[PDB]
Amino acid sequence: EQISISSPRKRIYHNILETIGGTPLVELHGVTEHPRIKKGTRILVKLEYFNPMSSVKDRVGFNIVYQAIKDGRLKPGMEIIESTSGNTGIALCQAGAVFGYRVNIAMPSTMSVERQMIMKAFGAELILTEGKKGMPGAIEEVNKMIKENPGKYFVANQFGNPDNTAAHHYTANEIWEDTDGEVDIVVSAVGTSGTVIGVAEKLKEKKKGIKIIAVEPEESAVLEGKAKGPHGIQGIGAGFIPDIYKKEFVDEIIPIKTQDAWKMARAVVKYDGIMCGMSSGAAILAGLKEAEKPENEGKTIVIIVPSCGERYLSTDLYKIKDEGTKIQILDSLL
Amino acid sequence: EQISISSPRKRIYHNILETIGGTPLVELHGVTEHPRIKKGTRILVKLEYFNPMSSVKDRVGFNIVYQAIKDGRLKPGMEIIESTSGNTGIALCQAGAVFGYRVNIAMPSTMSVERQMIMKAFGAELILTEGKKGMPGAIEEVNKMIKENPGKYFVANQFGNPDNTAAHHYTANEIWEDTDGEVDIVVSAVGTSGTVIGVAEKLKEKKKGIKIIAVEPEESAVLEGKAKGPHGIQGIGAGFIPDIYKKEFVDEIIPIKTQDAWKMARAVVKYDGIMCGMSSGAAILAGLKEAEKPENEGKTIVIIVPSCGERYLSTDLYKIKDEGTKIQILDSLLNE
Numbered sequence: 156e157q158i159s160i161s162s163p164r165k166r167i168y169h170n171i172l173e174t175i176g177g178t179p180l181v182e183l184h185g186v187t188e189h190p191r192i193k194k195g196t197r198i199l200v201k202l203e204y205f206n207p208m209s210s211v212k213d214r215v216g217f218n219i220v221y222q223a224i225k226d227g228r229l230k231p232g233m234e235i236i237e238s239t240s241g242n243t244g245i246a247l248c249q250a251g252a253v254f255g256y257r258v259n260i261a262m263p264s265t266m267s268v269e270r271q272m273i274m275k276a277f278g279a280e281l282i283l284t285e286g287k288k289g290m291p292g293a294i295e296e297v298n299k300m301i302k303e304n305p306g307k308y309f310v311a312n313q314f315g316n317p318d319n320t321a322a323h324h325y326t327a328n329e330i331w332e333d334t335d336g337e338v339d340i341v342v343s344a345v346g347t348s349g350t351v352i353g354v355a356e357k358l359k360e361k362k363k364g365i366k367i368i369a370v371e372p373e374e375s376a377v378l379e380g381k382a383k384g385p386h387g388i389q390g391i392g393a394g395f396i397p398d399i400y401k402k403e404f405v406d407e408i409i410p411i412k413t414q415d416a417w418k419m420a421r422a423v424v425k426y427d428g429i430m431c432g433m434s435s436g437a438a439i440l441a442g443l444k445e446a447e448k449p450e451n452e453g454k455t456i457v458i459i460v461p462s463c464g465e466r467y468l469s470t471d472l473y474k475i476k477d478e479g480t481k482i483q484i485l486d487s488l489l
Numbered sequence: 490e491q492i493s494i495s496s497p498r499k500r501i502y503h504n505i506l507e508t509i510g511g512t513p514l515v516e517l518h519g520v521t522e523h524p525r526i527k528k529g530t531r532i533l534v535k536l537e538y539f540n541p542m543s544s545v546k547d548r549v550g551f552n553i554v555y556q557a558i559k560d561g562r563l564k565p566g567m568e569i570i571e572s573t574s575g576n577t578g579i580a581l582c583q584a585g586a587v588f589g590y591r592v593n594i595a596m597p598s599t600m601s602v603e604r605q606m607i608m609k610a611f612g613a614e615l616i617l618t619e620g621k622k623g624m625p626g627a628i629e630e631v632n633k634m635i636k637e638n639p640g641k642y643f644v645a646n647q648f649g650n651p652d653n654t655a656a657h658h659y660t661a662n663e664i665w666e667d668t669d670g671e672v673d674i675v676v677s678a679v680g681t682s683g684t685v686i687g688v689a690e691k692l693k694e695k696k697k698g699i700k701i702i703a704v705e706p707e708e709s710a711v712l713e714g715k716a717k718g719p720h721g722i723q724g725i726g727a728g729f730i731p732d733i734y735k736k737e738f739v740d741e742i743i744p745i746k747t748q749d750a751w752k753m754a755r756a757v758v759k760y761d762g763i764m765c766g767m768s769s770g771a772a773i774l775a776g777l778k779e780a781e782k783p784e785n786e787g788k789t790i791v792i793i794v795p796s797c798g799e800r801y802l803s804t805d806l807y808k809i810k811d812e813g814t815k816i817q818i819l820d821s822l823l824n825e
């Protein structure tokens with residue numbers, strides 16, 4: 156029961172973008188204490204909120220913008236633009252601030268107000284579109300802006316841009332190195348699908364046998380061929396199959412109910428002291444469901460945790476008060 | 490010009506407490522581009538929001554609870570208690586969750602309701618006290634519970650606990666290591682003073698000549714012997730000299746005005762893309778003022794950044810919008 160904190164990094168970073176990646180892989184113990192999850196089975200969570208702006212999208216905003224600059228797709232005098240009301244817009248504002256590019260984020264005026272403030276703090280221009288029109292309204296205005304100003308804008312295009320997927324070759328390498336090649340199964344909740352496919356690509360290059368599991372809301376199970384539907388797992392369930400998705404790289408898809416995802420996240424912060432977001436709740440429950448299968452005994456399971464619960468305080472994540480013991484909570488989840 | 494992201498940690502952490510510390514030391518560039526700051530001077534920020542709950546206090550809550558467990562001051566059956574409405578509360582809740590101890594946090598019922606929800610998520614019991622009584626009301630209640638329940642509670646006592654100061658021997662080692670011994674000046678905005686003293690204690694062992702600079706609100710300059718007063722630099726300016734403060738380890742104290750601290754933090758996010766909190770605004774401004782002094786040319790200046798601006802969205806930090814170009818903003822901040 157000796158407990159050592161982290162050693163010095165022994166690096167001086169040249170700017171904040173160099174602190175992106177190399178996120179920690181942490182053992183779960185509290186939510187894994189269940190008679191069906193066997194002793195040898197290892198359940199690890201990769202905590203992407205250790206990134207400078209606390210989400211997986213940091214890797215994406217950075218790679219998209221940096222590659223575009225190296226490529227000549229983004230050049231001085233041009234501006235970045237994207238329709239997004241989430242973590243991607245924040246990641247793009249961070250990259251844009253460092254590189255010295257104006258960043259334009261379009262989103263329905265109904266959204267965030269807090270993420271709006273984050274994006275403005277970074278110096279972003281916000282393009283608040285008509286609330287009723289939702290994200291299609293934001294996309295529409297960006298298209299209108301590109302058309303009216305040819306040559307001026309670089310569109311991030313998070314669902315169609317392969318520099319998204321490619322960023323997660325680093326995510327995969329970290330998993331490989333950190334588990335010393337022992338990883339057996341990776342679980343990733345799917346938004347753009349950059350994580351699941353980019354991780355899958357790279358890991359399957361390392362070891363064909365690795366099982367890759369995508370997670371999506373049961374209420375909007377589009378990867379499994381269902382229709383787009385309302386759901387409350389923020390960050391995932393985009394309602395279409397992203398163009399960067401590659402089904403060949405995904406071995407199984409697990410649908411998780413919105414309410415279960417939230418309830419899992421509540422249990423994780425309570426019993427492991429890890430304050431994960433909503434989509435993490437879904438990924439972790441899927442991973443726990445894998446860990447209880449007899450054919451998975453002794454395997455190493457890695458679960459992506461894309462964001463931190465702090466970004467969800469204005470939501471319903473921590474409203475519901477679950478009852479029963481820990482074993483009771485976990486039984487109702489499984 | 491090559492930007493390289495971080496390499497794999499090559500470690501599997503047994504639990505989240507093992508990810509505390511080893512925070513990154515990052516160069517500032519955008520906010521250092523002012524004629525009075527010399528090219529050779531290195532201005533670095535140590536980003537304590539890389540801790541798992543996003544503040545320097547993760548170290549403190551961890552070490553307080555860990556040492557108490559190792560010493561026998563915290564034993565199965567007892568509960569943790571503290572009156573705090575800041576980051577220390579969250580740090581204690583995380584430590585408590587992992588070690589398997591109950592955490593009781595007392596604060597005024599009207600303060601940091603975001604932070605309230607964070608704490609309840611970790612399973613903490615909140616002791617919400619009368620709003621208009623503020624922090625002395627929460628302390629009074631904790632004193633009451635302590636008195637009526639002798640032996641039940643372990644009080645963190647962040648302002649008086651040497652385990653707070655001792656945690657920053659790690660902070661100091663990271664600074665020493667990361668700069669390969671080249672650190673010349675450390676700038677730290679003072680709340681409990683755990684950071685500035687614990688860092689000074691350890692670094693002054695390494696090398697004669699490391700200047701240690703404390704930072705406090707201009708409106709409440711108690712370290713400098715002025716009277717307590719109202720200020721808006723959250724996390725610092727406690728209004729008294731903490732029991733763990735040791736003036737002999739501090740070379741200079743810099744007062745910073747609230748509105749300047751905020752304006753600095755706004756400039757840092759906008760021009761360096763680093764979303765630092767209010768007290769970081771204060772420390773960075775003090776550090777840039779140091780970087781201006783001709784005797785400091787070519788020196789390595791390390792500035793502690795205790796928290797991320799995202800924890801401040803409800804405050805006026807980003808509500809006030811600065812007119813003017815980068816150079817006008819920086820010039821207005823170094824004004825005098």
Ligand SMILES: CC[C@H](C)[C@H](N)C(=O)O
Nearest residue numbers: 573575576577680724727
């Ligand atoms: C001086 C105030 C301190 C730093 C703060 N209230 C905290 O405990 O987090």
